[PDB]
Structure formats: C-alpha cells, structure tokens
Write a protein that binds this DNA or RNA. Sequence first.
DNA 1: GATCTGGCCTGTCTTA
Lengths: 342, 342, 77, 310
Amino acid sequence: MSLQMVTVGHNIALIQPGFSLMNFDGQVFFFGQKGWPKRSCPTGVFHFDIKQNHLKLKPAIFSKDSCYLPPLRYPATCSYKGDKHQYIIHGGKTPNNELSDKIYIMSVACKNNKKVTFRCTEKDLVGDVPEPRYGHSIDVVYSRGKSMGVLFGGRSYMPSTQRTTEKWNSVADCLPHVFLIDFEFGCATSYILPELQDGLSFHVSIARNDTVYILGGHSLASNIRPANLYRIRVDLPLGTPAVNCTVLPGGISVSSAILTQTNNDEFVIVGGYQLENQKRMVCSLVSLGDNTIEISEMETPDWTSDIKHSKIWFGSNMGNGTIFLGIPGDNEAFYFYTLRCS
Amino acid sequence: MSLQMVTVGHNIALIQPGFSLMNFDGQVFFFGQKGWPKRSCPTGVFHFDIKQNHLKLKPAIFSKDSCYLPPLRYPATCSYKKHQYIIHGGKTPNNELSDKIYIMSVACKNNKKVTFRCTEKDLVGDVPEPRYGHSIDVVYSRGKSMGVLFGGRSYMPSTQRTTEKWNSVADCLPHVFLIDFEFGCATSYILPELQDGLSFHVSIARNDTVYILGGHSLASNIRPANLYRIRVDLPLGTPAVNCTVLPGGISVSSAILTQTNNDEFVIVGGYQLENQKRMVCSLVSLGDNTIEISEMETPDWTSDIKHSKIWFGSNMGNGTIFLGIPGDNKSEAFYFYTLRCS
Amino acid sequence: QPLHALRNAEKVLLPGYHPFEWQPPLKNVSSRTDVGIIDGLSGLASSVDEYPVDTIAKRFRYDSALVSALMDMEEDI
Amino acid sequence: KPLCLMLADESDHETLTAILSPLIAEREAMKSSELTLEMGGIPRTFKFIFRGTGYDEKLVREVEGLEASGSVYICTLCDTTRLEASQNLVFHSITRSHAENLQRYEVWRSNPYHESVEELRDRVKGVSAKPFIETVPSIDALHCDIGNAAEFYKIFQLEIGEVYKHPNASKEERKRWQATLDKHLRKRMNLKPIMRMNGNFARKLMTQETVDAVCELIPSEERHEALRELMDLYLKMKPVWRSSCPAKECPESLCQYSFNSQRFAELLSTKFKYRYEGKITNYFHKTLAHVPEIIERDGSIGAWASEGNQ
DNA sequence: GATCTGGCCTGTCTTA
Ligand SMILES: [Zn+2]
C-alpha cells in the first residue's frame, strides 16, 4: 500500500475509462484506446512502460497473419496457458457503440531487441452462442487434464424486437446463464442454475483449478449491489460436463473493483463503487485454502485529498501486484496514480 | 548611398515619428520617445548605438543640477560650440506646445557612462510663441554667436481658439528672431522678402549666413522651391539682418539634412506632393558666398519604401542617416533602416 | 407611424434643438446653439507632414448635451 | 448618457489627450458660470458641480500623472508607501488633490533644490507626468470587490496547501491545489472555473457557505476558525462601501466600521504573516484606511461606481 | 587574478 504519482508523455488523450492492460512475461501492454486508431499506431496495442515514475506509450506491430480487431471498451480478459501463453478477449464495445461478439486471441509470435510482434487470431463460436455484451467476466478452468472457459452473464442493449429509437441506448442485464466454451473446438453451451436468480454485471470473478469465485457486482434489475459471493464448482469427465453453484456467507458489495494477485493462491482486491454517490475507499484481502475462502480488511492506504473527493475513478491490473488507476481533472484531462501492495 | 536593415531590441515601441537624435563626440543619443518616461528610464534620454546591424537602446541619467525636460515631438535642434545643443518648442505628450528653451550638455563621462546637465534658459523680450516644426541655427560674426529662429506652426490665438476647432493649426509670422544665449534676450525682425508662413523646412548654417530650403505653407497648400539667404551681421551697435532670394531651389518638406564632408551637405527624404514622395537625393555644395545644389545617383531603394506612404528619420551626425517606415499592427509597427553617405 | 415620421420626431430629443445662453459667456467656446454631432478630431491636422492620425471619433458639444439632458427631465423636476 | 465615442488605444496617451482636450476645456470653462433656459414657459437658473469618479485605478494613474500600480506609492488618496501601508493598515488621511499633483509635477520638472533622482522622487511622492483631468479621490467599488475576491481566492489556494507549514512549493503543487479548489467549488457551490475574476462569481464566492465548503479541504482546525472570522469581518464591512445610503440602511455597520477594520488588520498581521508580511495590495489599503472619510465626506460609496459605463 | 560591480535577465506582483 503505497501511492505514487505517474507522469505521462504526449499521447495521454489515448487513455479512456475501460481500457485493458495485458501482461506478457513481465512487459505490460496497453489496449482499448479512444477512437479509431490513427497512423501513429495502426494496430492499437501500446507498450505500457513505466520508468522513474513516468509513462511512455509507444506503438506496437502485429504479425503477417493477424486480424486487426477494433478497440474495445469493456472486454472480458483472462489468462490462458495450455503450449503458449495467451489471453482471451470476448464481447466489448466498439467506438461506434456497437457490441462485438467475436473472440480474439492475443499471443506473442516473435520478439527481438525488446520489440514484440503479436498474433491476433479470430475465433468463432457454435451451438449456444452468447448475446454480445459488456461488463461480464470470463475465466479458465482445468479439470482432469482438460481446459474449459466459464462465461458469466453481463449487460447489453435491448433485443432486436423491443429496441426502439426513442430508447436506442437502453441497457438490461443478460440472463444469468453459465456458458462453457471449449477453446480447442469452439463449441459453447448454456446451462441453467437455480441458485443464480438475477442478472449481474461489473462483478469480480476469482479463478482457480476447477472453481470460479464470483464476488460482488451490480444488479441493474433492482438497482442494488448485493453482498453475496458464489462458488461455481465444475467437473470435466469423459461425458458431458456438470456445473454446480452454492451460495456462501460473508460477501462484499462492490462494483467495478480491480483485482490483482499478490502471492501464490492469494488475492488482494481494491475498492470499487460501494453506492451511487458513496465510494469504497478501504481495501480487502482474499486468502484461499483448498475448499474454503477468507476475506478481511487490510490497512487503508494513505489516500490523497484529490482522490478522497473525486467522484469517478477507474483503472486495471498491471500484473506484478500493482494497480494503475486514474483521476479525472478539468477542461491534463486525467491524473494517473500507481499503487503497489507487494 | 547604401541601404541596410537594422533590428531593434525590446523597447521598439518607444520610437515615434518626430524623435531627435543628438551626437556628442561620435555618440548618437536618442530623445523624444512616445508617452511619458517610465521607471525604465526616468529621464527619457537613451544611448542610440548600433553594433553589427542591431539596435539597443540603453538608458542615461542626469546630474544633480539638471532639469527633467519633458518629451518633445517636434523641437528645433541645433549644434553649438564646450560642445552643447539647444532645444526649443515641440509637442508635449499632453498636446501642449512648450515656450521654454533647453540646453543639453555633458557633465561627467567615464567607461561609456555619460551624465548630462540639462539647463533651462529664461528668454525675455520679443520671445517667440510656442511653435513646432521650426528651425534654429547659430551664426558667427565678429567673434560673436547668435541664434536665428524662423518658421514653425502653432495653434490659434487664445482669443480666436474655439473648442469646436481646438486642434486647428496655422503657420506663424515670417518674422526672424535673433536669440542671444548669454543674456537670454530675443529681438523681432520683419523683412520685406518674407510674406508666406513656412514650416517643415531645411536650414543650412555657415559663418554668418543661413540658407532656407523648401517647406510647406498652410495658407496656400503649396510646396515652393525656394532658396533664401540671411546674412546676419553683428556690429558694435545693433545687429543688421538682410535677406536675398536665389534661383535654383528644391520643392520638398520634412527632408533630412546631413554632412558628409566640410562645406558640403546632402539632402535625402521628404515629400514632393501630398501623395507623392521624394525618392531622389540632392547634393549641396558651398563656398565663400556661392551655393550649388546638384544631383547624385539615387540609392538602391527596396520595394518597402517605394510603396510606403510615410517615413521619418534624423541625422545621426557621422555621415549616416537613420530612417524608419511603418508596418503591420497587431506585430512590428515600424521597420527601421540606416543610410550611409561617405 | 412610418419611418420618416419617426426620424422627424427624433430631432426634438437630440441636442442642438433648444435655445439657451450662459450669463457669463463661455471662454473659448462658441455661442451658436444648433450644433449636433461635432467631429471628434476637432480639426486635427491629417496631412502627411504632421504626426500620423489613425483614429476616428464622433461626439456632441458639452453644453448642448447638458441642455438636452436637463430638458429631457422637465416633468421629473 | 453618452458623450464621446472613439477608436483608440486606452494606453495611447497622445491620441487620448488630443481627442479629450476640447471636452476638458469646455468643462473647465463652464465650471465658473451659470445656465439659464425657459422650461414650462419660465426661465430658470442652473449651476453645475461635476465629479469624475467612474474611473478604474489604471486610468486614474494615467490621467492624474502617477505611475503604474506596481510601484510603491500605491494609494491615489494618500501618499504612503508599500511598507508603511503594510505596517499600519489603518491610519491614513487623504491629501491628494489635482492642484497638489500639478505642483508636484512642477517641482519635478523644475528641480529647484538640485536633488538626485531618488531624492526628487521622494520629494514629489511619485509624480512624473502633468495631470490634464481633474478627478475625485474616491474608490471604485466594483473593482474593489473583484480584487478582494481574487485575493481571497488566492488565500484559499494557499490555505489548502498549508503554506504556513511548508514555505517552499513547486509549480505542479500550485497547479494541483488550484485544480482541487476549482473542482470542489464546481461540485459544491456550482461555479465553473474561470480565467479572470468575474463580478457575479465574486458575489457568489463571498458567503459563509463557501467557507464551509472550503474548510472540508483544510485538515487543521484553527485555520477554520481563522477563515470564519475573516469572512465574518469582511461581510460586516462590505455593506458600508456597497450600500447606496449607509446612514439610513446600515447605521450599525457604519458606526462599527473602524473597530471591524482594526480587527481585520490585526487578524491579517497575526495569523496571515506568510503572505501579508511587509507587503499589501491596493484595495485592502483603500478599504481599511480611507472608507470612513469618504463616507463622511460624500455620504455614499457605490452610487458613484463605474458600473453604469460597463 | 580572484573581487566585487554593472548591467541584463526574469519570475512575481499589481492593476486591467
Ligand atoms: Zn492610501
């Protein structure tokens, strides 16, 4: 817990709320800029590099067989190492306010002189495909030497029937179904769980060997931020998979929280949004066991007077137990701070 | 004969049409700035020097017995021989014509630091009314000196001056005034060879004769080509002044007199008609009693002067002639040139 | 009323329409009492030889303006 | 009512004097006469007493023959310096008249005693120009309010950052402090950030609520009390120079103005040394030193303001 | 030949 100011280069206007920092072997990379990419960097992926408390965003290139995906403002990021380390991107929101549904897979194809070359391959789904949506979260699951993705519901626009031009930007939470996506083939399947009763968005999901921990979130159906955490334990036999969910005591009511990993089988979460005009300022610690959980309240960081009164704040995860968050200014549009918690 | 561009420093705004450069031992000194003197220079007398075609105005101070003379826009400068100058008439920044007479000199000089001694002189007798644009010279007859004032413009009399025409001006009487610098007395001489009020003329002084050149007459709006001779005599009784008209005159007003070599002068600048400007030069040769006005090759004027509508300058003294032309306003309001004749 | 009627009625309110006289005659000020919008330059020299003029101005006469102001407030007084 | 319209620079002295000479001439001419005219069929008689008060301080310095405001002779009503005006704050009578300025300029131009630049400047009390317009030594209430609001705003900025605790500060710290104050005021008092101090912004900024909102940023507790009493004294002194008739609209504030001004000066001298030590602005001096005398002389400040021209 | 001076700059303060 140690705040620190971070200066910026010339291209500060390219950062916007909802970006996604991706980490590949120590190097943190930027994605999800504002507007369509210009001739400064046609790809849109930037080398997120901080040195001497100073940010320097520089362009990056793709391979000769990649796919130039549009910048997304609320994708679903997750790590996947099952080989070549690679990330997964689903959903998002294009700069034309259009929701995407295609899955993109990032990967490092070549590198030299500290200059990487990405490989963005397109991935399509079959069977029970999910509605294009944002604010959701996807995780990976390992079971009996086999991988599988878990996609929880989020929010999206009106369906193609009731959507009218007088409410063209209305948003409703998607149905609380669990989607299992096989990355090797591309076949998704929708399951129903009686425990999942209401839609949830902007939540935080913790992944492990074979169980996903959904903690907190925001429900648009009733405008309530619940304080219940879920435990979706799955299994991958030779036959059809089986999913189960059990509610658990001791939840947390936070929306738009930023999660990061500190040690092996241990996570720390920072504040998000507690109420509409009330802002969560104290952090929480998540300690895992083998079939149990544990939450506690760490020492509150030495917040500054500008953050203590700012209404909006956003950020993401760098990867080395470090959080990069920003504060809006006036008319220098954002003030970006970093946070290290070992 | 050769024109040259000269750049001015930061205080370029302090130069206005009607300034008066004065030379003391090969050192040209600026005078007659715009507006009242500020805290940058409480006296208003600068060190006009040019190094490698670049102008830098440096301030100057006065002795512990001087008189802080106000800025004047059209005085009548005149050399005298220790070495000292005379200032009479001119327009104060409050648009008031001064009736006093001033005497500048040098008191202490060391390491290019000049300390002036401005002494006011009280004139009694046939004193001239406050004027502007006139001329004054000094004649030497039988080991004596005498000031010869002539011409000039002024406002209407205090009885005939109305606020509806508060700024109306008229030419003064063609009288000739002799000023004794020791006693401080004036004397009015009316001559039958002078019937037209003259202003903005040129005056050439010699041992006992002064030569009037060109000018303008408000009573006729004409630029007469005149060549007058005034041979002032200083006997042991009353000074007897005579006049004589001479052929071969020049039609010009507001010209600039200089001195290349002894007993020969050069005329440059001025105005032939209202909208027409004098572009040719004129050589003036002198002898014991003869006069000769000849023509020389015109300098290589640039496209700036040939299409400008107004210009203003003054004799630097050492053969060179300073010159300035207007420009854009927002920007640089005036461009400034130098012209050498040697 | 049409525009010419309005323009004609305007002349009653503008200065230089009512007679008056100062009991001590004003020094250096004319006694004529029908001047309107006097030029701002006040007969300033605008030739090429004098100081350059790059401004324009219009204004009334001071005494006529005071007379018009006082006559505009007759009913009030 | 308009009298003259021209297209010229205010700082341009020559053109300004050349255009305004006839008006001043006619004014000085008829300031010694009487007018007669027949209204209602009966000839009357009139006498005029003109008072030039709708001039901001810069134009006053220009026409009265003084120098820029950044000098040491700050007041146009008295002839005190910046150090004395920062060490006294209270006792300063007005001795500055048009004839006095003319005599000062005559002494400056003539130099009858044969003194140096500094000695003669001290003798003339900073007069190096010939006056051409006779003005009344009064106060412009609009610009006074604007300057006081700007000064306070600056004081707020300095109090957020605890200058009394850290005398040194970089520029980014200043920028941050100003941005935080602007953001807070926008979110609480509903005031947008402005470049130059406004008039309505100045009116809305000078409230108890504003101090209440600002104190949410200062962690100290005594500073709160200091700012509360500062704003209280200022709001107790405002109606004296802002009312159109203090003798019949706020007699208590008029009778207690001296005591309040002395307490205000003592507060600034004690708990605000970090900014007001050995220096002071123009309007603070004008308000704390010269208001009661102008009130007892003219009867009302504010009715003679330069707001109508604006 | 280091030693204060002269003068030139420059950031801050004051009115708009
Ligand atoms: Zn004062």
